[PDB]
Write a protein that binds this ligand. Structure first.
Ligand code: HEM
Ligand code: HEM
Lengths: 218, 218
């Protein structure tokens, strides 16, 4: 149950119905091994593709860092006409078609725009997090370090993850880290939206993805 | 006008058609005065709305500055469950419904998701430009001031713009501005994406919006 979805049925199931038979015809199949770069930004051949199996990372690449924009799973649509790089996170099979062909089927077969909405919403979600993370780069680093440090020092193992009884509210965390209550508030909300953590009570957080948070502390 | 569109017809027009009977009455109307804040990030009520008339700015707000993500115009869909502020740029009338009602609408009436794709694409395009702008803040400013100077020195008026001769290729410009070749190209392509210019080759640019470019030199 990927949270950006507007429908409960996977697009691959829909495409393999007989009401959608003939749309499949216009797609070709390509395989990619783990870590293979599928596409560099704005490729010469404008393609719309569908992930058939595996996981694909859509990302902005710079010299010293990369920002993940989205992770495409089975049934997710994307294209080659963005400023993003596209990499296979695991052994991957895609189905692809020329853009001129997809123009027709997106207006005719409703299930496609529904998935695009889900994928573009996810990309925008991660983009806003990235922008917040750049505006508050230093505060974010300090907060993530504070939390990972607390997790290792006093974190408690629970079935959902690591419970952090910080004994500090957001105001007090901001004081500890030399930022504002408002900034820590934005950043914690962002960590929640990333599925990194949940709020247990005023002074307690549940760290559900420590390993991921360890990437923001570097 | 936006090139993100997958249709030529306005959602407000489609909402008047027979096939869409009953949909309109699922929305209520609210008027907003010029400069009024419609919604703060993630308001108590989770709503989907359509701009009936006026123009609405979607933006990120920090204590120092704001980043505009999109201008929504008549016929555009947005929601109240994002981390952005939403402000009326002029006297505005919106049509709003609870998200739980919109769930049924978006699945059965295809025009809504097509408009969402256009809107989300425009927000994402603006978002990626913002990200690049933050990562390369210094280099961006120095490039903009170079291009404004080059316009003053070499600029020849042509229909729809100003032809610039830089006298330098991308590597040489990079050396001059104390940056990498890769950063110059990325920022030049972003200026293209913003409608500021076209790249004829490494040495020649067509400037379509000098005024907007002077905003990056400030
Ligand atoms: C019907 C087929 C499609 C058409 C005709 C189309 C057309 C376009 C056009 C003309 C642009 C540039 C608009 C501008 O100048 O602002 C664009 C950008 C973009 N499109 Fe598509 N597109 C299609 C399918 C898709 C799909 C399947 C996706 C992925 C879900 C997608 C995602 C994007 C994104 C993220 C951008 C902005 C890229 C950037 O700023 O680097 N599009 N599209
Ligand atoms: C019935 C229709 C809708 C449903 C079921 C829905 C559902 C959701 C859910 C569950 C999330 C949070 C995803 C997560 O947990 O990561 C979300 C986020 C988001 N949605 Fe929607 N939504 C709908 C309509 C819309 C509309 C109309 C728009 C605007 C065109 C939109 C744009 C966004 C954006 C930009 C986010 C990310 C917000 C942020 O990160 O600040 N959604 N949606």
């Amino acid at each position: 149950a990927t949270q950006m979805r507007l429908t409960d049925t996977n697009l691959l199931e829909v495409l393999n119905s007989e009401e959608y038979s003939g749309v499949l015809k216009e797609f070709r199949e390509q395989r990619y091994s783990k870590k293979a770069i599928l596409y560099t930004p704005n490729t010469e051949r404008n393609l719309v593709f569908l992930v058939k199996s595996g996981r694909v990372r859509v990302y902005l690449a710079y010299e010293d860092k990369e920002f993940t924009l989205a992770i495409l799973e089975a049934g997710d649509i994307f294209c080659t006409h963005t400023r993003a790089f596209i990499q296979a996170m695991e052994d991957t099979t895609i189905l692809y078609t020329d853009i001129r062909n997809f123009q027709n089927i997106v207006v005719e077969f409703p299930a496609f725009s529904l998935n695009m909405v889900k994928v573009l919403g996810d990309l925008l979600k991660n983009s806003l997090t990235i922008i917040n993370g750049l505006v508050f780069k230093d505060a974010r680093l300090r907060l993530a370090e504070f939390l990972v440090q607390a997790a290792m020092d006093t974190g408690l193992k629970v079935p959902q993850g690591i419970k952090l009884e910080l004994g500090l509210n957001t105001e007090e965390i901001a004081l500890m880290l030399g930022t504002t209550r408002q900034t820590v508030s934005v950043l914690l909300n962002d960590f929640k939206k990333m599925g990194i953590l949940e709020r247990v009570n005023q002074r307690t957080l549940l760290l559900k993805d420590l390993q991921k948070l360890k990437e923001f502390s570097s």
